Swiss-Prot record, chain A:
Function recorded in the entry: Precursor of the fusion protein processed in the biosynthesis of the S protein and the formation of virus particle. Mediates fusion of the virion and cellular membranes by functioning as a class I viral fusion protein. Contains two viral fusion peptides that are unmasked after cleavage. The S2/S2' cleavage occurs during virus entry at the cell membrane by host TMPRSS2 or during endocytosis by host CSTL.
Effect of residue 28 to I: In strain: Alpha/B.1.1.7
Gene designation per UniProt: S
Lineage per the UniProt record: Viruses, Riboviria, Orthornavirae, Pisuviricota, Pisoniviricetes
Protein name, as recorded: Spike protein S2
Residues listed as glycosylation sites in the UniProt record: 21, 29
């Protein structure tokens, strides 16, 4: 059932931004995200 | 913009289409 497949890679999910001259998006909820970074 | 005697020229992972999509 499970096997190695060959396919064209995806660079990200498609998301078309609905542009409008009388509309804006303002966030109402925030999430404090903690990310790591490792450098020698 | 500006061989076959053991010199293997491999193509990169992201071609000119994937850079244009980025």
């Amino acid at each position: 059932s499970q096997s190695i497949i060959a396919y064209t890679m995806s660079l990200g999910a498609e998301n078309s931004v609905a542009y409008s001259n009388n509309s804006i998006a303002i966030p109402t909820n925030f999430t404090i995200s903690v990310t790591t970074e490792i450098l020698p | 913009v500006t061989k076959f005697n053991g010199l293997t020229v491999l193509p990169p992972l992201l071609t000119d289409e994937m850079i244009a999509q980025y």
